[PDB]
UniProtKB/Swiss-Prot annotation:
<feature type="binding site">
    <location>
        <position position="206"/>
    </location>
    <ligand>
        <name>2-oxoglutarate</name>
    </ligand>
</feature>
<feature type="zinc finger region" description="C5HC2">
    <location>
        <begin position="391"/>
        <end position="443"/>
    </location>
</feature>
<feature type="binding site">
    <location>
        <position position="286"/>
    </location>
    <ligand>
        <name>Fe cation</name>
    </ligand>
</feature>
<feature type="domain" description="JmjC">
    <location>
        <begin position="152"/>
        <end position="318"/>
    </location>
</feature>
<feature type="binding site">
    <location>
        <position position="216"/>
    </location>
    <ligand>
        <name>2-oxoglutarate</name>
    </ligand>
</feature>
<feature type="binding site">
    <location>
        <position position="208"/>
    </location>
    <ligand>
        <name>2-oxoglutarate</name>
    </ligand>
</feature>
<feature type="binding site">
    <location>
        <position position="200"/>
    </location>
    <ligand>
        <name>Fe cation</name>
    </ligand>
</feature>
<feature type="domain" description="JmjN">
    <location>
        <begin position="8"/>
        <end position="49"/>
    </location>
</feature>
<comment type="function">
    <text>Histone demethylase that demethylates 'Lys-4' of histone H3, thereby playing a central role in histone code. Does not demethylate histone H3 'Lys-9' or H3 'Lys-27'. Demethylates trimethylated, dimethylated and monomethylated H3 'Lys-4'. Acts as a transcriptional corepressor for FOXG1B and PAX9. Favors the proliferation of breast cancer cells by repressing tumor suppressor genes such as BRCA1 and HOXA5. In contrast, may act as a tumor suppressor for melanoma. Represses the CLOCK-BMAL1 heterodimer-mediated transcriptional activation of the core clock component PER2.</text>
</comment>
<protein>
    <recommendedName>
        <fullName>Lysine-specific demethylase 5B</fullName>
    </recommendedName>
</protein>
<feature type="binding site">
    <location>
        <position position="125"/>
    </location>
    <ligand>
        <name>2-oxoglutarate</name>
    </ligand>
</feature>
<feature type="binding site">
    <location>
        <position position="198"/>
    </location>
    <ligand>
        <name>Fe cation</name>
    </ligand>
</feature>
<comment type="subunit">
    <text>Interacts with FOXG1B, PAX9, MYC, MYCN and RB1. Interacts with HDAC1, HDAC4, HDAC5 and HDAC7. Interacts (via PHD-type 1 zinc finger) with histone H3 unmodified at 'Lys-4'; the interaction is inhibited when histone H3 is methylated at 'Arg-2' or 'Lys-4'.</text>
</comment>
<comment type="similarity">
    <text>Belongs to the JARID1 histone demethylase family.</text>
</comment>
Length: 453
């Protein structure tokens, strides 16, 4: 037996409300952050055109066994041959035509199937960022001639290629090519292909658009219940919490939302249909599965609302010895160095995060001086490859400062882990720092001038 969770909120913005995605997300935030996910139906005439040759789009499939609580890690088809496989799979599974399989029946059967070890069902799917094959489902510029209808959507705020580089996004002016977090992912689904329970890197927002095909079923949990959900999963499946040696080595799993609900974790559901958006909020866990053959596109993003949570996230990563995708402090200082061109509300919010950064850094430097670290030298941390500037102990990506020792050339610890670097006494250590305190205060003042205008 499966008892469906309550439905998440659904928003139907007017064209006036829809025009600015960041203003809209800020508006609905008081409601949607209580449920973790929400659905957005665009105005009825906002319809971006979909244009693809099913025979020239190629991708390498991933394969998936469907067993609840089993760990999963974080050939070649055209879109036509995948679709033919996917449709045959589903109509053979149910001995029905595909449009007559009720979505409630697919959902019921999915949770039966994953809990029965007597069933050995495996499925395939596509998941990758855009390239030369495959390509965004939204219109992009390229010197093809576009139709006027495609040109209408080139600069839309809801074209997921544009959303990151808009001015109310803070991941905008970052220049460390991250790939994973400014570029959309493309998802080609089939019946029962599923995404395991997760949150996004650095606790970012995400936005997902279903271009066409059968629906995508979602489960979501509010940010406030994140640690509650994790404690439930630790009890029931401890193997997933053994620390792994790379950010490409993470373990995730399928888990029945009724189990979370039995342990008093709030869970919401929705069926996302073609032409609709789903938005996930910072630190909101989510999972789901595809009802049939379909095609979706998604991207991470970060608003000014998110900035303090981003700082909290990197602290939580340090406690867990988890790798970072980028340095939060580096992004803050980059924006400070471009204060004259920042949105004024962005400038105001970055200024507040920077004040916390500077006070924390002042206290950390005082502590390490009292440990007997005396020598110091400026260092341009942003020039080092990331794997050359991670703390030996907690794996954090250094930027404001680190400790080195000539006893162990090339190794660094952050200022929380001075005792973990090597056996030599601390007078042989060196504080390497990006900025003096006196460099930092004028940087924060530029932001205030920009904000106060
Ligand atoms: C079943 C497929 C098509 C699918 C997937 C999916 C399956 N595996 N992966 C991997 C790829 C590699 N990877 C990283 O690189 C980390 Cl960034 C980890 C995740 C993504 N995710 C999602 C979401 C979400 N959220 C919404 N719909 N959706 C899907 O339909
Ligand atoms: Mn099974
Ligand atoms: Mn996700
Ligand atoms: Zn450290």
């Amino acid at each position: 037996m499966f008892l469906p969770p309550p439905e998440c909120p659904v928003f139907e913005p007017s064209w006036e409300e829809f025009a600015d995605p960041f203003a809209f997300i800020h508006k609905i935030r008081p409601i949607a952050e209580q449920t973790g996910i929400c659905k957005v139906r665009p105005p009825p005439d906002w319809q971006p055109p979909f244009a693809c040759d099913v025979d020239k789009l190629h991708f390498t499939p991933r394969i998936q066994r469907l067993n609840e609580l089993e760990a999963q890690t974080r050939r070649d088809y055209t879109l036509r041959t995948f679709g033919e496989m996917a449709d045959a799979f589903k109509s053979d599974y149910f001995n029905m035509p595909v449009h007559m399989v009720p979505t409630e029946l697919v959902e019921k059967e999915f949770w039966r199937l994953v809990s029965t070890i007597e069933e050995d069902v495996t499925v395939e799917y596509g998941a990758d960022i855009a390239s030369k094959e495959f390509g965004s489902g939204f219109p992009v510029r390229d010197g093809i001639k576009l139709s006027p209808e495609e040109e209408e959507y080139l600069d839309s705020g809801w074209n997921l290629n544009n959303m990151p580089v808009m001015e109310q996004s803070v991941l905008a002016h970052i220049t460390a090519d991250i790939c994973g977090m400014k570029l959309p992912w493309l998802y080609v689904g089939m019946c029962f292909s599923s995404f395991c329970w997760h949150i996004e890197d650095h606790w970012s927002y995400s936005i997902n658009y279903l271009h066409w095909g059968e629906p995508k079923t979602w489960y979501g949990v509010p940010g406030y219940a994140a640690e509650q959900l994790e404690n439930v999963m630790k009890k029931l499946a401890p193997e997933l919490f053994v620390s792994q040696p790379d950010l490409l080595h993470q373990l995730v799993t399928i888990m029945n939302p009724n189990t979370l609900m039995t342990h008093e974790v709030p869970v919401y559901r929705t069926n996302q249909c073609a032409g609709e958006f789903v938005i996930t909020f910072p630190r909101a866990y989510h999972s789901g599965f595809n009802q049939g053959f379909n095609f979706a596109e998604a991207v991470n993003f970060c608003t000014v609302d998110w900035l303090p949570l981003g700082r909290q996230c990197v602290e939580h990563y340090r406690l867990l010895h988890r790798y970072c995708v980028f340095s939060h402090d580096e992004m803050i200082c980059k924006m400070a160095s471009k204060a004259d061109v920042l949105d004024v509300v962005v400038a105001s919010t970055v200024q507040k995060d920077m004040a916390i950064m500077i006070e924390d850094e002042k206290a950390l430097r005082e502590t390490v001086r009292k440990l007997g670290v005396i020598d110091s030298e400026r260092m341009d941390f942003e020039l080092l490859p990331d794997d050359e500037r991670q703390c030996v102990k907690c794996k954090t990506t250094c930027f404001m400062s680190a400790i080195s020792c000539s006893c162990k050339p090339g190794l660094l610890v952050c200022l929380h882990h001075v005792k973990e670097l090597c056996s030599c006494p601390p007078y042989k250590y060196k504080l390497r720092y990006r900025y003096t305190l006196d460099d930092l205060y004028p940087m924060m003042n530029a932001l205030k001038l920009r904000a106060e205008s």
